[PDB]
Design a protein around this ligand. Structure first.
Ligand SMILES: [Cl-]
Ligand SMILES: [Cl-]
Ligand SMILES: [Cl-]
Ligand SMILES: [Cl-]
Ligand SMILES: [Cl-]
Ligand SMILES: [Cl-]
Ligand SMILES: [Mg+2]
Ligand code: NA
Ligand code: NA
Ligand code: NA
Lengths: 616, 619, 616
């Protein structure tokens, strides 16, 4: 019966029986709310835009209702009103869609087709394999689909890029732009983002660094407070890295037993300045190893920084390096090794600098390096503190000597087993205001300069050293003013084969201050009596010193003492044959052949005695 | 039976039994049934649970309120609770009346119900917002299309982060941790990118991004990129206490134009007094660059500025009336520091620009009217000069004799500078200690030149391979020069012009022929124009091969005197009988060139005697 | 028939054709039909697609399990997959029995289906959580109301960030990047605000926020705000290796009360030994302040503390038994540093407080029993004094003669201090180089005062316009003073009291009348009480206008001796026969005032000779 069918259709759409009609080519649609196609057995809501007299024309399988007025897609209107038919079966069985309001199930979720009809779906299809999802293709419909899509997006990583973010909302801030939460979160990189974990050896964080750097990331932070094990050697750093610890809590640590293991490399492409790789910063972290390693190897590099780094058994090795700063670092069993033989052009490295560092058992060993500078540092114990060497050495006339400057200022060197300073090839150096107490364990000088030229060593204190406080060997044309040499085992200041040095002011002796000293037996000694041009002026010697000065001050040596306490001013004296050849006017000479003083008279051009008589 | 057929199709619709559907009729017992039908309205509604036997139907209105024996029930309300709805034929656009709570009206392919009082009339061309809004007591959206559109809107319009509650550490419960929003937590940091910044090499004007970020109240601003942030709008005023942080020295803030008068940033106090100086801030870990030479920052009436790990390229820093500025771990290429004080109309002095651990190439430091410039542990290479000081007000009035200010230069290296490494005018109370200077070769200039100096100390420096003298002092007085080395300079080691009361002690002069460069220095110390007085040389170790070790007039009236300088005569007391000193110290020894003998002043006899103790003739 | 009619009604509901609906009857061929009807339960169900011809029906139970000749199918499960549901009468609160997977039961205007064993009896008064829970195998929410409510709860209850998966760089696929959660990524950083901190000027007690933040294990804590964070609970103990980071020096951590005994933070080791010292941390980029004077931090038994770009106001730092502490780029206003060591019951010493690039006004540095205080590149203005050192344990036993410690003061400026710039007691091995001092004018005090000094060097400093002497040395021995300038001081340049064996070399004294302030200095160098010995002046350039250049007893027994100081006579060896030196070097020259002649020593004969060679 048509009446009962119209009636149950009315119940479905929530309308009145009076308001339903069968499509019939020639009816006045006006007034009806729902139309029924008896051929397809589908019902459709009618557009509110229906005027009396508009009569049917043709109603097709696509539910396109052609009437007198114009035409209407009843399927499209049905989607608009969320009035759907869920087809039997599924994408897997396949089916054909003819109307915009037909749904097809895939995996317990429904889809409608937004493209051209009819749409045939072959058996074994999925929405993706049959047009994909989007405007003009498959669009998901309904509860199950929305739930799955939300669960999937939240759980698969895609959600943060779909959330728009703007700084300061809900406040409207002039100039703030829309970004995504993904973008904003990506403003920072932690090692953890690349699988890093401070789990004390379970994770190989070497690979996390490698991957992080390969992504283009440069500034990498450590979240943890524990030990990040490193197990793959020779990770190459990118130019201008910055690795940031969590407030000096976490360690980047090698936990193995291979002393050849190296954590990181930094490598330029060749020896010239345009080939040096730009370094970066390590800060606020511990670099450590249970065995001694060279933790980083830099070759052909410039502008490296380490700030607030704690190094444990981890030596830094650089070869052909240019400007490196260690600031506020703590170095335990962790040497600095600088070389330049890879610089095949000039055979030089430049400016390793240490500021506000503390070191224990951590020597600084630089060869063929210009302008090593150490300022406001404390170095404790170790075999030695500072060593310099020159491996070129062999000069060609008119050059007479090869070497480089160090600058060492207001630093403390204490309880070093050997020399605090073992400086070979020191040229134009300035060494000012330091405290040195070293060498006791090996009966070594506190400081030893072998091969020095044109340098200044000013205002330093050498105390309680294992031999001399300071020994100068093969040093020329250099100044030593205001230095104190106290309580040293064998002597204060010693020279060997030096030439043209000034030793001015300061003081030598023993002051017996609580905390350690020897009774120093010698002040200044030219130990092998073979220096010339050594000038001592104004030095305050402790009267109790057994030997204040040992120095040959005979007339041809050019060695001379003036106003040094407990030592006479050098007197020109000698035999008649050793009278000077070109004396200044009124020159006074004590003639040991005659046993009298004599004076050079420049007008007569003769030596005379005190009574005015010519001698000779 | 048509009633029965209708009852049946309704039972199918609700999933109930056929006999559980009842028509409304006044008086009928409602117990047991599940669904009631209104024959007038032609609507069905689920009945509420628990209608006990005896309850009889009384009335049912167009709003689907059912009245019965034991009370009443809003069947529209019940239907909403069970998500049992009717979608009316219209839309908000054609207009409709809403009579019951479970009727839905379509707006833009989405459904809404009315949560207000009923009936609800809706004129054509209405919307949920125009007809009472959306929320409790008004329109509430219902169903799939609505929820999908609202979620899409929410997620895409920026409001979502503020709705997500966040607490640090969850799901762990951390004592003291508070609830915030994701929005809040994300806003804890500001990147230039948040205000439109982009390192796209000139497409974006990042000057505006800085201006907008600062105006928001942001102070600490980070750069995310590794490329070039182009700057195209001049004179962006910095707030007090900014911090601009680059991405590990990778990105550049760069001027790409051709106007050499462009300036990126200004920092400007409100006047010249200390409580009016604007508090500066920090630039760190980045490159400040320009293709043409510019003054990239101009500070006027400012205090407490820091630059740390900044690489400057063609970018000069210009400050006028400034107080305490630090450059630390900077790399300065073609990038001058220019300090002035004429805007300080109170004292006309600026204070304490300080450089530490810097490397400079072609980047002079040029300060006028500035007290306590300090350079420590720095390297300066090339350039026209490295350090220049000047005093504008060379205007003193007696009893004042001189005007100037101190510099402190310590353990720094100045190398291959084309002119003077140090060009110091008006240098007073300065300390210059432990430095290396090799400068002036390209222009035949002194390594260092002090013109107008008072009461200063220059100690333990090395001047080597300089283009004229290592160091020249002109109009310097009451100053000490101890332990300095002067090696292999073109013309001489140390020179004086019109100086007074200087001590030159120790150190050494000569040439040591070290591989890397030197001249054969022909002169040690020279009083170049023979017009200085009170110049005291003591204990200086001269290379014997020096042609002229000392050039100095040591006659009695000059007060110039030499003692223990190798290869140089000591200044001896000597002269004619007429020139015997008038008030000699006790036992004074004088070589009398008239007599050709030494004589001694005896303070007891009050006479000059020879060595035999006889008085010499003396009127 | 009514069966025909019911089938038609059902067909409309499912959107199928009338002949595609079938009643379950045992034995029927099921193929071809789309919907089946159970006439007993009066429920309809979609049939699964593709039942093959000849598949005959066996049974259909109250669970809607359809058993047939080829197998069985759960039509309830299929209904769920197609979102074809029945909403039961009633609710969880009234109770019900669930028999089929596609039955829904309402609770709180939301629907649930049962995913567990059927049937499921729900007792009256139930809720989903009370009647089995929500999740797989239990209750599962269905539909619009439920989903809306669940979305609102999940965003608002704090659990959402941990549910959102995150990976760095998406949608780009970055090798090595791992999945984390948004919660994890946000938790990478800690602000004080996360623990309730607020810069609301006293309303919030931020002391407690810090306590809670550190108790969580967090170490690096950031301040978001630019205002005042009030602190109201005293003695918050810092963890080891904290880092507190201000917002670019804008915010203040401030005490707003009136109790001068209030202390913000403590850092406390477990005892005096090196393995018991607590590792400190960093404060940076912030203001520490109080309206009344307080000791804002108290450190006891501590090592490795840093303060960088901190502005201190009325806030003294007090450390007792401390080892290595750095203040860099700090501004100190009315904010003393107080260093002590009496809590070190082992050695009674503290070590290496260091100041670099600091500015201070009215903020003295007062350290007792402390080795190696170092001040470099600093400026100190005003205050009662700038730098003070003291020794508590002054008494010594033979062979010790003296107790004290080094200070290192380099290239720093001390100006307009009311009393002494430097008040140094027990100064041993100190190096004081390249400083500028102008102090004491307000109290007629010396610019610098060293009382008890040994084996130290003071080089290349300038002392100008001080309130008495530029520098006074009292009880100083075996020390060097080279290249210093003493200008324009009220009473004198350099003074000594009870000293022994000092060298004073070069530099200059006088007044240069430079605009900006000076006195007319009346005295150069003075041995003020005429009781020092072994004082050696060499090469000092004195202003000719000085009224008294040198005040010093240079008689033969005092070992005091002047050479080449302008305007001062050179010291001549002279005196009575009784005071002739015993056994001096050969040809030593002495003016014998008893005989009124010079005489020369002949070492071999052990006799004095006159200039004619005769014994005297
Ligand atoms: Cl990062
Ligand atoms: Cl690699
Ligand atoms: Cl003569
Ligand atoms: Cl602006
Ligand atoms: Cl006499
Ligand atoms: Cl606590
Ligand atoms: Mg129906
Ligand atoms: Na290796
Ligand atoms: Na307290
Ligand atoms: Na007295």
């Amino acid at each position: 019966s048509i009446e009962v069918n119209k009636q149950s259709i009315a119940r479905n759409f929530g309308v009145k029986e009076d308001e339903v009609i069968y499509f019939t080519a020639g009816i006045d649609l006006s007034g009806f709310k729902v139309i029924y196609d008896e051929s397809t057995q589908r019902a459709y809501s009618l557009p509110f835009g229906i005027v009396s007299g508009t009569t049917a024309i043709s109603l097709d399988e696509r539910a396109i209702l052609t009437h007198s007025a114009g035409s209407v897609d009843l399927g499209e209107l049905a989607v608009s009103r969320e009035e759907y038919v869920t087809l039997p079966g599924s994408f897997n069985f396949g089916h054909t869609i003819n109307v915009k309001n037909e749904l097809l199930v895939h995996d317990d979720k429904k889809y409608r087709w937004d493209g051209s009809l009819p749409k045939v779906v072959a058996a074994g299809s999925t929405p993706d394999s049959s047009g994909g999802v989007g405007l003009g293709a498959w669009l998901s419909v309904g509860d199950a689909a929305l739930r799955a899509e939300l669960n999937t997006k939240v759980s698969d990583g895609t959600f943060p890029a779909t959330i728009k973010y703007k700084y300061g909302l809900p406040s409207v801030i002039d100039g703030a732009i829309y970004r995504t939460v993904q973008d904003k979160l990506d403003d920072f990189v932690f090692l953890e983002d690349f699988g890093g974990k401070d789990d004390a050896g379970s994770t190989d964080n070497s690979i996390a660094f490698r991957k992080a750097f390969a992504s283009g990331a440069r500034k990498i932070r450590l979240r943890g407070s524990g030990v990040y094990g490193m197990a793959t050697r020779d990770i190459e750093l990118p130019a201008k890295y910055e690795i940031i610890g969590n407030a000096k809590n976490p360690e980047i640590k090698y936990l193995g037993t291979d002393t050849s293991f190296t954590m990181f490399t930094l490598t330029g492409s060749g020896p010239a300045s345009n080939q040096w790789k730009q370094g970066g910063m390590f800060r606020d972290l511990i670099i450590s190893s249970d065995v001694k390693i060279n933790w980083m190897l830099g070759r052909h590099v410039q502008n490296l920084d380490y700030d607030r780094v704690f190094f444990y058994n981890s030596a830094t090795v650089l070869n052909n390096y240019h400007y490196v700063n260690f600031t506020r670092c703590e170095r335990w069993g962790s040497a600095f090794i600088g070389r330049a033989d890879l610089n095949t052009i000039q055979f030089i490295s430049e400016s390793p600098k240490f500021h506000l560092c503390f070191s224990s058992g951590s020597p600084i060993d630089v060869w063929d390096t210009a302008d090593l500078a150490i300022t406001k540092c404390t170095m404790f114990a170790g075999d030695y503190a500072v060593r310099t060497r020159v491996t070129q050495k062999q000069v060609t006339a008119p050059d007479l000597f090869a070497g480089y400057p160090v600058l060492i200022t207001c630093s403390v060197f204490d309880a070093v087993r050997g020399h605090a300073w073992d400086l070979e090839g020191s040229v134009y150096s300035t060494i000012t205001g330091n405290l040195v107490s070293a060498g006791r364990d090996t009966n070594s000088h506190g400081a030893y300069i072998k091969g020095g030229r044109s340098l200044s060593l000013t205002g330093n204190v050498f105390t309680y050293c294992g031999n001399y406080g300071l020994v100068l060997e093969d040093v020329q044309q250099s100044g030593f003013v205001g230095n104190v040499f106290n309580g040293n085992k064998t002597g204060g200041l010693g020279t060997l084969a030096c030439k043209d040095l000034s030793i001015v002011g300061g003081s030598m002796g023993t002051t017996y201050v609580r905390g350690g000293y020897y009774t120093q037996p010698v002040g200044y000694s030219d130990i092998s009596s073979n220096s010339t041009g050594i000038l001592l002026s104004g030095v305050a010697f402790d009267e109790a010193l057994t030997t204040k000065v040992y120095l040959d001050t005979s007339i041809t040596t050019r060695n001379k003492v003036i106003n040094c306490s407990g030592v006479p001013d050098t007197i020109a004296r000698g035999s008649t044959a050793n009278r000077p050849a070109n004396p200044q006017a009124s020159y006074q000479y004590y003639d040991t052949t005659l046993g009298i003083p004599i004076w050079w008279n420049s007008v007569s051009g003769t030596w005379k005695n005190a009574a005015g008589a010519d001698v000779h």
